Amino acid sequence: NRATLQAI
Amino acid sequence: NRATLQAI
Amino acid sequence: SGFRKMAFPSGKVEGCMVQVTCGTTTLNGLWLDDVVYCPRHVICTSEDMLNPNYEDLLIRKSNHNFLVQAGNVQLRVIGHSMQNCVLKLKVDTANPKTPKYKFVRIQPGQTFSVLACYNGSPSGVYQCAMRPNFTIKGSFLNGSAGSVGFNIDYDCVSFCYMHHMELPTGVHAGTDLEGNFYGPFVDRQTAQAAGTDTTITVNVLAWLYAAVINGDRWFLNRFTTTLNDFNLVAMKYNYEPLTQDHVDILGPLSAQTGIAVLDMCASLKELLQNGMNGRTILGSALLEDEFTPFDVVRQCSGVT
Amino acid sequence: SGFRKMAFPSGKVEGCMVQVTCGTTTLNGLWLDDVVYCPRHVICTSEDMLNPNYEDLLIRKSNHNFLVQAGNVQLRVIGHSMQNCVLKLKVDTANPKTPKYKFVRIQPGQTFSVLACYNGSPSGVYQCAMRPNFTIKGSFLNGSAGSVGFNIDYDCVSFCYMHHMELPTGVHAGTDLEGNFYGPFVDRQTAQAAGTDTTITVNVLAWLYAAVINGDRWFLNRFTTTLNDFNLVAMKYNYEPLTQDHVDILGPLSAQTGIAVLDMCASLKELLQNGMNGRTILGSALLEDEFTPFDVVRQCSGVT
C-alpha cells in the first residue's frame, strides 16, 4: 500500500 | 452534596 | 480516513461572547444584535444561591447594576428582563459580528459543540452529547456559566445550550436559549441528582459503522438478529430501544458499508455479551455513544 | 470539574484559511500578511505524484497558474517560491485578519489543535498529539492538505503543523510551517511506513493526575516505586522512559493532589500489569497518553 497526498 | 452554580 | 471527536469551528460564536458582571458575581453572556443573554443567577450574591427568589432579586436591580464588557469596551445596558432562567439585557450597540442564527432545543442523544469561556474570553472548544437523563458530561469550572453549545449548518449557528451549573456527580446542567432547563433541574445550590442514565444505542451503531469505514472489522460476524430479539438484549444492558426510525436513519451508512443494520446489531449483541477480549475499536476499549449518525456521515464524508 | 479533550478556539485561524488551486489540483493555504503557505504538491497532476521532481514541476509554473480564493474574493498572486515541502505564494493583499503568530516546531509528545479544512472552508476542530514516531492520528480526507495545527498563548497563534498526506495505516504526516517534515516521510505516493510507536509515559501520568483531581481514585495504592524500577516496567510495556525532568514537570500536579510522582508511578505499574478489571478512568477503559501536563493544568485550572 501507498501513501496518499491529500490535495484533490 | 449540593449543586454548584458556575458564575463567579 | 481516521475518526475523531470533532467540534465545529468556533469563530462565529467567539465574536458573540461577552462578560456580564452584577455586583461581585460575574459570568459570560451571548451578544446577538442589541441583546445580551446570560444565566439569571448573575444577580445572586453567594448567600442568595441556596433559595433565591429571582423575581424579587431582579426587581431590586436596574440597568446600571449590570456591567457588560465586550473585549475592553463597556456596553451600556438600556433595558433588562427575565425570561425563564436567563436574563435579556438590552444594550445600546448591536453586535457587528452577529452571525445568522437560530435558537433550537435539542433532543437527548443529539450532539453539539461547547465553547468554554471565562470572563467573556473563549478558552476551548469540545463536543458534547445531551444524555438521556438531560445532563451533559462537560468540562466546566467556576466562571464558565453562560458558555453556549451550538451546531453550525451552512453559515447559520443554531444555539441549543447555555451552561448554568454542575451537579454533585460532576456532570453539568443548563438551559436552551429561551432559558428552559434541560431536565428536572433548577438554578439553586440544593441537593439535586440526575435520573438514571442509559446508553444511546443508535449512536453506538453509528460509531460501529464509522469503525468499519475506517477498517476495524474484527467485531463483525455472519449472524443477524431481529429488532425484537436485539431490543431484549438492549434492555438487559441498559441500552435504549432501537426503533425502526433508527434503522432508517442508519440506512446510508448501512448502504455504504454493505452491512445490514440488523447484521450490525448482531455484532453489538456479541460485544455486549462478551466484551472486546482486549481489542479496541477506533482507539477505544468501550462502546462509544456520543457520535450521532450525522456526526459519522459528516466526518467520514467531509462537509466544510 | 470534568475533563475533556479540548481544542483551542479556532476563530483566529479560520480567518487565515484560503483555497489554492493549480490546474486540476486544489487544497488549502494559510494566508498571513501578504503570503499564502501551502503544501507544494498542489502543483502535481495525479500522474505527477508517484515520483515528482518538484523543482522541475515548479519551474514550469508561473504566478497566473495559481488561483487563490479568500471566500469569494480572488487574491492575485505576484510571486512564488518553494521552501522545503511548502510553497510561498506572494499575493497583492495583506490579510487584514492576520493574528499575532509564530512558526514553532513541536516535539513528539506535545499536543496541538487541528482546524480541518476543505476548499478553503473550515470544517471542524480537534486536538492531536505528535506521536513518538512523528505521525498524528487525525481525521483527514482528500482535500484536507494545507489544514494547520496550532497552539494559542495570549493572543499569539503558534503554528506547528501543516497537513500533507495519509500513510497506509491510516495515520497522518505533515510538516512544520517552514516545510520540513515531521519524521522520515516524503511527499510522494510511495510505500512508506511509520516507525514503531511507543506510549507517552509523562502524559499518562498527567492524565492520572487529572483523574484524581476529578475524583477517580480507585487505582491509587499505598505503594511507591523507584524511577529505576518503574522504567524497567515501562520498557517492558513499550512506554517511554520517565526522566527526572518529567517528574519535575509533574511537580505542580503532584503538589495539588498530594500524590508523589513516584507514588503515581506505582499505580501505573499496577494498571500495566493487571489492567482495570472492568473499571474506567475519566470515562476511558484504556490508559490515555494524548494529554500533556500543560493540557491537564490548563483545563483543571481554566486559562481563557
XYZ file of C-alpha atoms in Angstrom:
624
model
C 0.000 0.000 0.000
C 0.993 3.605 -0.792
C 0.814 6.958 0.877
C -1.898 9.321 -0.325
C -1.256 13.048 -0.795
C -4.382 14.758 0.408
C -4.924 17.561 -2.051
C -7.820 16.988 -4.515
C -23.847 17.222 48.289
C -25.236 20.302 46.501
C -25.337 21.667 43.011
C -22.932 24.489 42.212
C -23.974 27.479 40.090
C -20.995 28.253 37.928
C -20.842 32.017 37.852
C -18.002 33.544 39.948
C -9.629 8.463 6.991
C -9.461 8.491 10.802
C -12.320 9.310 13.150
C -12.095 11.944 15.847
C -14.383 13.715 18.238
C -14.688 16.942 16.292
C -16.201 20.281 17.172
C -17.495 22.939 14.814
C -15.158 25.868 14.086
C -15.927 28.347 16.838
C -15.056 31.721 15.325
C -18.690 32.745 14.733
C -19.510 32.158 18.384
C -16.303 33.721 19.753
C -17.379 37.018 18.330
C -20.559 36.932 20.439
C -19.092 36.211 23.786
C -19.073 38.978 26.447
C -18.535 39.262 30.184
C -21.530 40.177 32.426
C -20.963 41.344 35.988
C -23.564 42.126 38.636
C -22.145 43.230 41.940
C -19.483 40.748 42.867
C -20.786 37.903 40.632
C -19.559 37.566 37.057
C -20.131 35.134 34.152
C -20.403 35.077 30.351
C -23.154 36.378 28.124
C -24.089 35.857 24.480
C -24.359 39.129 22.487
C -26.635 38.876 19.410
C -27.872 42.111 17.765
C -28.602 44.531 20.651
C -29.340 41.915 23.344
C -27.077 40.053 25.788
C -28.379 36.686 27.076
C -26.942 35.299 30.325
C -27.828 32.935 33.190
C -30.098 34.763 35.620
C -28.077 33.750 38.686
C -25.572 36.530 37.863
C -27.893 38.600 40.101
C -27.351 36.347 43.097
C -24.903 37.060 45.831
C -23.197 33.989 47.294
C -25.804 33.874 50.096
C -28.661 34.370 47.579
C -27.977 30.998 45.881
C -29.420 28.403 48.268
C -33.037 29.604 47.864
C -33.141 32.603 45.511
C -36.414 34.312 44.665
C -35.341 35.527 41.260
C -38.337 37.795 40.637
C -37.558 39.618 43.927
C -33.820 39.714 43.211
C -34.456 41.237 39.757
C -36.961 43.868 40.909
C -34.258 45.241 43.149
C -31.812 45.800 40.245
C -31.781 48.364 37.480
C -29.804 48.822 34.227
C -26.760 50.398 35.847
C -26.241 47.334 38.074
C -25.162 45.288 35.013
C -21.614 45.786 33.700
C -21.248 44.273 30.194
C -17.785 44.190 28.659
C -17.093 43.262 25.057
C -13.304 42.969 24.961
C -12.159 46.201 26.582
C -15.307 48.114 25.527
C -18.136 48.560 28.041
C -21.613 48.141 26.543
C -24.244 50.327 28.092
C -27.304 48.446 29.311
C -30.578 50.185 28.469
C -33.158 47.531 29.347
C -33.394 44.263 31.233
C -35.863 41.450 31.612
C -36.145 37.866 32.841
C -37.142 35.057 30.516
C -37.366 31.707 32.382
C -33.791 31.105 33.708
C -31.976 33.593 31.520
C -31.708 37.392 31.539
C -32.088 39.561 28.437
C -30.003 42.725 28.735
C -30.787 45.262 26.040
C -27.623 47.222 25.139
C -27.155 50.379 23.062
C -24.969 48.730 20.356
C -25.876 45.918 18.015
C -23.109 43.332 17.774
C -21.451 43.902 14.376
C -20.301 40.271 14.406
C -23.789 38.732 14.822
C -23.954 35.588 12.671
C -27.025 34.165 11.064
C -28.515 32.216 13.985
C -31.432 30.161 15.345
C -32.431 29.171 18.914
C -33.242 25.424 18.792
C -33.862 22.951 21.553
C -32.198 19.577 21.052
C -33.180 16.018 21.972
C -31.329 13.585 24.203
C -28.881 11.691 22.074
C -28.023 14.733 19.915
C -24.571 16.363 19.959
C -23.286 19.956 19.898
C -20.064 21.939 20.294
C -19.354 23.791 23.577
C -17.261 26.976 23.528
C -15.997 27.085 27.095
C -15.482 30.689 28.281
C -14.253 32.601 31.337
C -14.629 36.345 31.867
C -16.088 36.762 28.397
C -12.972 35.139 26.847
C -13.097 31.823 24.926
C -10.909 29.115 26.491
C -11.504 25.929 24.455
C -13.931 24.015 22.253
C -15.214 20.467 22.643
C -18.062 18.206 21.593
C -20.877 17.057 23.987
C -23.989 14.875 23.714
C -27.258 15.646 25.549
C -27.527 12.481 27.785
C -30.856 10.568 28.047
C -31.039 11.997 31.579
C -30.670 15.577 30.249
C -27.220 16.190 31.716
C -24.015 16.726 29.695
C -20.571 15.385 30.587
C -18.652 18.599 30.066
C -15.581 20.373 31.389
C -16.627 23.460 33.299
C -15.129 25.405 36.207
C -16.489 28.227 38.281
C -16.985 31.210 35.979
C -17.998 29.121 32.964
C -21.733 29.787 33.263
C -23.073 31.488 30.155
C -20.831 29.475 27.817
C -23.001 28.137 24.987
C -23.413 24.989 22.955
C -24.238 25.056 19.260
C -24.276 23.374 15.838
C -23.427 25.129 12.537
C -25.254 24.490 9.264
C -24.107 26.498 6.255
C -23.407 29.867 7.870
C -26.167 29.574 10.483
C -25.347 28.988 14.159
C -28.161 27.039 15.905
C -27.647 27.718 19.579
C -29.028 24.902 21.717
C -27.433 25.152 25.168
C -26.377 27.732 27.740
C -24.396 26.477 30.704
C -25.634 27.100 34.319
C -24.357 24.618 36.894
C -22.600 21.443 37.991
C -24.428 18.612 39.754
C -22.853 16.733 42.688
C -21.734 13.839 40.468
C -19.618 16.200 38.329
C -21.992 16.308 35.340
C -23.425 19.564 34.023
C -26.862 21.098 33.540
C -28.185 24.082 31.672
C -30.914 25.576 29.560
C -31.885 26.132 25.978
C -31.516 29.789 24.835
C -35.081 30.593 25.871
C -33.972 29.804 29.451
C -35.829 26.486 29.848
C -33.769 23.848 31.629
C -32.889 20.561 30.049
C -34.158 18.037 32.561
C -35.664 18.325 36.033
C -33.029 20.721 37.389
C -33.320 24.198 38.957
C -30.763 27.013 39.262
C -30.329 26.665 43.043
C -27.439 25.319 45.128
C -29.510 22.461 46.507
C -29.202 18.694 46.642
C -30.204 17.587 43.152
C -29.485 14.422 41.223
C -29.839 13.244 37.673
C -32.150 10.400 36.766
C -30.568 7.087 35.890
C -28.790 7.335 32.520
C -28.876 4.918 29.589
C -26.598 4.278 26.577
C -27.603 5.805 23.198
C -27.992 2.677 21.014
C -28.338 4.301 17.610
C -25.196 6.237 18.280
C -23.222 3.116 19.227
C -24.329 1.588 15.937
C -23.306 4.694 14.039
C -19.833 4.573 15.630
C -19.516 0.872 14.709
C -20.233 1.883 11.115
C -17.550 4.578 11.384
C -15.209 1.827 12.616
C -15.893 -0.412 9.580
C -15.495 2.593 7.222
C -12.063 3.092 8.847
C -11.082 -0.602 8.603
C -11.854 -2.006 12.083
C -13.840 -5.150 11.142
C -12.872 -7.685 13.820
C -16.236 -7.456 15.674
C -18.245 -8.271 12.532
C -19.875 -11.699 12.193
C -22.065 -13.688 9.817
C -25.070 -13.594 12.230
C -28.135 -11.392 12.012
C -30.837 -10.729 14.551
C -34.396 -9.448 14.745
C -35.252 -5.984 16.045
C -37.286 -7.695 18.758
C -34.511 -10.023 19.904
C -31.954 -7.187 19.809
C -34.165 -4.934 21.970
C -34.412 -7.714 24.565
C -30.622 -7.627 24.792
C -30.555 -3.801 24.831
C -32.911 -3.575 27.771
C -30.784 -6.049 29.748
C -27.632 -3.926 29.279
C -29.345 -0.550 29.883
C -29.320 0.460 26.214
C -32.163 2.460 24.752
C -34.570 0.606 22.468
C -33.767 0.727 18.785
C -36.612 1.937 16.651
C -37.409 1.356 13.040
C -36.752 5.097 12.614
C -33.203 4.485 13.935
C -32.754 1.627 11.416
C -33.911 4.050 8.701
C -31.592 6.808 9.855
C -28.699 4.361 9.690
C -29.693 3.498 6.096
C -26.968 5.489 4.310
C -24.195 4.084 6.496
C -25.585 0.550 6.069
C -25.541 1.087 2.288
C -22.043 2.482 2.191
C -20.651 -0.471 4.127
C -22.944 -3.208 2.816
C -23.697 -4.299 6.376
C -27.397 -4.503 7.219
C -28.460 -2.632 10.361
C -29.773 -5.830 11.931
C -26.473 -7.552 10.987
C -24.628 -4.793 12.874
C -26.989 -5.295 15.806
C -25.847 -8.950 15.961
C -22.283 -7.615 16.395
C -23.384 -5.234 19.132
C -25.191 -8.105 20.904
C -21.953 -10.136 20.931
C -19.848 -7.186 22.130
C -22.341 -6.586 24.946
C -22.310 -10.259 25.993
C -18.571 -10.978 25.590
C -16.703 -7.611 25.683
C -13.781 -6.992 23.367
C -11.215 -9.590 24.683
C -8.540 -6.912 24.840
C -9.100 -5.365 21.407
C -10.137 -1.799 20.567
C -12.476 -0.080 18.129
C -11.401 3.305 16.735
C -8.907 3.514 19.590
C -11.444 2.889 22.373
C -11.859 -0.117 24.670
C -15.512 0.865 25.393
C -18.544 1.194 23.180
C -18.827 4.922 22.335
C -22.302 6.530 22.208
C -21.673 10.282 21.709
C -21.479 10.251 17.894
C -24.744 10.628 16.007
C -25.297 9.111 12.562
C -24.970 12.664 11.245
C -21.618 13.153 13.008
C -20.370 9.927 11.391
C -21.560 10.814 7.889
C -20.172 14.364 8.310
C -16.701 13.237 9.144
C -16.473 10.095 7.072
C -17.606 12.415 4.065
C -16.249 15.938 4.764
C -18.799 18.793 4.788
C -16.955 22.145 5.289
C -14.870 19.755 37.054
C -14.888 17.205 34.216
C -12.038 16.529 31.813
C -12.426 16.637 28.058
C -10.239 16.573 25.008
C -10.345 20.282 24.278
C -9.150 22.304 21.328
C -8.232 25.971 21.245
C -10.884 28.372 19.917
C -10.267 28.431 16.185
C -11.540 31.836 15.081
C -8.057 33.360 14.691
C -7.036 30.567 12.344
C -10.330 30.470 10.409
C -9.657 33.958 9.213
C -6.403 32.809 7.581
C -7.654 29.887 5.640
C -7.852 30.137 1.815
C -8.267 27.788 -1.125
C -5.296 27.267 -3.520
C -5.838 25.681 -6.919
C -3.228 24.751 -9.510
C -4.621 23.204 -12.643
C -6.975 20.484 -11.563
C -5.476 20.023 -8.052
C -6.802 22.043 -5.127
C -6.099 22.258 -1.366
C -5.974 24.791 1.480
C -3.462 27.522 2.151
C -2.624 29.676 5.165
C -2.772 33.444 4.440
C -0.606 35.553 6.800
C 0.226 39.162 5.805
C 0.816 39.084 2.015
C 1.927 35.433 1.740
C -0.035 32.193 1.266
C 1.658 28.989 2.513
C 0.502 25.645 1.091
C 1.739 22.078 0.514
C 3.904 22.029 -2.603
C 2.121 19.022 -4.117
C -0.687 21.360 -5.269
C 1.495 21.622 -8.407
C 1.308 17.903 -9.098
C -1.090 16.344 -11.506
C -2.412 12.930 -10.466
C 0.303 11.237 -12.570
C 2.991 13.582 -11.150
C 2.591 12.169 -7.605
C 4.388 8.811 -7.695
C 7.843 10.337 -8.343
C 7.544 14.129 -8.611
C 10.587 16.290 -9.258
C 9.260 19.353 -7.504
C 11.980 21.747 -8.680
C 11.148 20.804 -12.310
C 7.395 20.969 -11.695
C 7.733 24.468 -10.179
C 9.998 25.889 -12.896
C 7.259 25.120 -15.368
C 4.654 27.225 -13.492
C 4.250 30.959 -13.158
C 2.108 33.270 -10.974
C -1.014 33.032 -13.110
C -1.127 29.233 -12.688
C -2.110 29.667 -9.005
C -5.739 30.548 -8.225
C -6.086 31.746 -4.597
C -9.581 32.356 -3.265
C -10.317 34.015 0.054
C -14.056 33.473 0.473
C -15.463 34.646 -2.848
C -12.573 37.084 -3.472
C -9.707 36.020 -5.748
C -6.267 37.073 -4.494
C -3.816 37.914 -7.211
C -0.533 36.029 -6.978
C 2.509 38.209 -7.648
C 5.381 35.935 -6.624
C 6.027 32.293 -5.842
C 8.786 30.225 -4.339
C 9.484 26.795 -2.860
C 10.672 26.388 0.706
C 11.313 22.699 1.557
C 7.875 21.000 1.119
C 5.727 24.108 1.147
C 5.071 26.862 -1.401
C 5.102 30.573 -0.568
C 2.716 32.486 -2.826
C 3.127 36.237 -2.558
C -0.255 37.956 -3.077
C -1.128 41.621 -3.633
C -3.238 41.995 -0.434
C -2.141 41.589 3.148
C -4.634 39.563 5.169
C -6.476 42.088 7.373
C -7.243 39.279 9.828
C -3.602 38.228 10.412
C -3.200 37.373 14.107
C -0.064 37.719 16.128
C 1.733 34.483 15.209
C 4.898 32.361 15.461
C 6.135 29.345 13.438
C 7.321 26.755 16.006
C 8.302 23.152 15.590
C 6.975 20.834 18.288
C 8.355 17.701 19.950
C 6.854 14.227 19.999
C 4.531 14.008 22.943
C 3.279 17.603 22.541
C -0.317 18.417 21.553
C -1.967 20.968 19.243
C -5.358 21.830 17.750
C -6.123 20.919 14.103
C -8.534 23.079 12.090
C -9.659 20.640 9.421
C -10.495 22.443 6.149
C -11.792 21.676 2.651
C -11.783 24.113 -0.264
C -10.514 26.894 1.972
C -13.505 26.418 4.331
C -13.116 25.279 7.973
C -14.949 22.014 8.712
C -14.111 21.096 12.332
C -11.589 21.413 15.150
C -9.933 18.675 17.187
C -6.911 18.009 19.366
C -3.900 15.849 18.249
C -0.594 14.748 19.789
C 2.650 14.423 17.782
C 3.331 10.626 18.233
C 6.848 9.386 19.187
C 7.022 8.090 15.604
C 6.234 11.575 14.207
C 2.801 10.688 12.846
C -0.520 12.107 14.113
C -3.769 10.168 14.487
C -6.029 12.683 12.797
C -9.211 12.786 10.749
C -8.413 13.884 7.224
C -9.987 13.213 3.825
C -8.844 14.039 0.342
C -8.749 17.825 0.032
C -7.647 18.413 3.627
C -3.991 19.087 2.810
C -2.958 22.557 3.923
C -5.072 22.412 7.093
C -2.890 23.547 10.002
C -2.237 22.635 13.601
C -1.571 25.244 16.263
C -1.496 26.303 19.925
C -2.652 29.717 21.231
C -0.900 31.627 24.014
C -2.367 35.001 24.946
C -3.345 36.325 21.519
C -0.468 34.644 19.668
C -1.076 31.666 17.368
C 1.991 29.353 17.267
C 1.555 27.339 14.108
C 3.303 23.979 14.354
C 1.830 21.687 11.690
C 0.616 21.753 8.097
C -1.106 18.640 6.819
C 0.204 16.805 3.672
C -0.707 13.124 3.476
C -2.083 9.873 4.858
C 0.096 6.798 5.375
C -1.160 3.290 4.520
C -2.063 2.533 8.149
C -4.494 5.485 8.238
C -2.264 7.810 10.288
C -1.227 11.234 9.027
C 2.012 13.039 8.221
C 2.946 16.622 7.555
C 5.419 19.416 8.012
C 6.185 22.324 10.257
C 5.396 25.740 8.670
C 8.899 26.005 7.222
C 8.019 22.913 5.139
C 10.222 20.398 6.993
C 8.518 17.053 7.521
C 7.918 15.603 10.930
C 9.540 12.196 10.707
C 11.145 10.237 7.880
C 8.333 10.820 5.374
C 8.327 12.356 1.872
C 5.508 13.958 -0.139
C 5.262 11.126 -2.692
C 2.611 8.442 -3.222
C 5.019 5.630 -2.412
C 5.105 2.737 0.023
C 6.077 4.364 3.312
C 5.611 3.254 6.891
C 5.944 4.802 10.298
C 8.498 3.556 12.784
C 7.231 1.543 15.715
C 5.305 3.800 18.118
C 5.523 3.994 21.907
C 3.205 5.306 24.660
C 3.912 8.796 26.103
C 4.534 7.998 29.802
C 4.575 11.508 31.224
C 1.280 12.160 29.556
C -0.324 9.027 31.023
C 0.803 10.221 34.441
C -0.609 13.671 33.809
C -3.985 12.159 32.849
C -3.955 10.021 36.023
C -3.490 13.245 37.982
C -6.423 14.771 36.084
C -8.417 11.682 37.106
C -7.627 12.138 40.830
C -8.426 15.887 40.582
C -11.824 14.812 39.179
C -12.429 12.159 41.873
C -11.378 8.875 40.202
C -9.118 7.397 42.927
C -9.713 3.639 42.677
C -6.319 2.912 41.015
C -4.363 4.625 43.811
C -2.404 2.499 46.294
C -0.118 2.852 49.301
C 2.956 1.615 47.329
C 5.767 3.696 45.894
C 8.485 2.761 43.459
C 11.898 3.939 42.316
C 12.443 5.704 38.998
C 14.749 2.838 38.052
C 12.277 0.073 38.872
C 9.439 1.959 37.144
C 11.491 2.396 33.945
C 12.125 -1.360 33.873
C 8.359 -1.839 33.797
C 7.900 0.942 31.209
C 10.335 -0.618 28.783
C 8.554 -3.981 29.059
C 5.184 -2.430 28.110
C 6.563 -0.176 25.333
C 6.289 3.022 27.378
C 8.851 5.765 27.010
C 11.342 6.179 29.849
C 10.385 8.652 32.531
C 13.004 11.264 33.190
C 13.713 13.337 36.225
C 12.658 16.305 34.062
C 9.246 14.606 33.633
C 8.994 14.145 37.433
C 9.786 17.864 37.777
C 7.243 18.881 35.166
C 4.613 16.894 37.043
C 5.547 18.768 40.246
C 2.562 21.148 40.345
C 0.038 18.366 39.775
C 1.767 16.196 42.404
C 1.517 19.118 44.849
C -2.107 19.849 44.126
C -3.109 16.238 44.724
C -0.601 15.339 47.438
C 0.401 12.230 45.499
C 4.134 11.896 44.864
C 5.123 11.277 41.239
C 6.819 8.009 42.164
C 3.679 7.035 44.148
C 1.636 7.610 40.974
C 4.151 5.520 39.043
C 3.399 2.611 41.421
C -0.264 2.935 40.346
C 0.694 2.967 36.679
C 2.855 -0.146 37.216
C -0.153 -1.991 38.685
C -2.501 -0.841 35.903
C 0.027 -2.029 33.315
C 0.416 -5.434 34.999
C -3.242 -6.078 35.928
C -5.441 -3.857 33.679
C -8.502 -2.152 35.098
C -10.732 -5.208 35.963
C -13.660 -3.619 34.160
C -13.399 -0.125 35.647
C -12.769 3.168 33.841
C -10.718 6.306 34.404
C -12.191 9.618 33.214
C -14.577 7.603 31.056
C -11.881 5.541 29.309
C -11.068 1.834 29.604
C -7.509 2.448 28.264
C -4.618 4.484 29.564
C -4.754 7.821 27.683
C -1.471 9.446 26.562
C -2.502 12.475 24.444
C -2.843 14.987 27.301
C 0.288 16.865 28.318
C 0.857 18.113 31.867
C 0.114 21.574 30.477
C -3.198 20.408 28.975
C -4.170 18.991 32.384
C -3.218 22.111 34.340
C -4.946 24.296 31.705
C -8.247 22.551 31.980
C -8.232 21.605 35.630
C -7.465 25.442 36.260
C -9.148 27.425 33.436
C -6.907 29.771 31.406
C -9.065 31.711 28.862
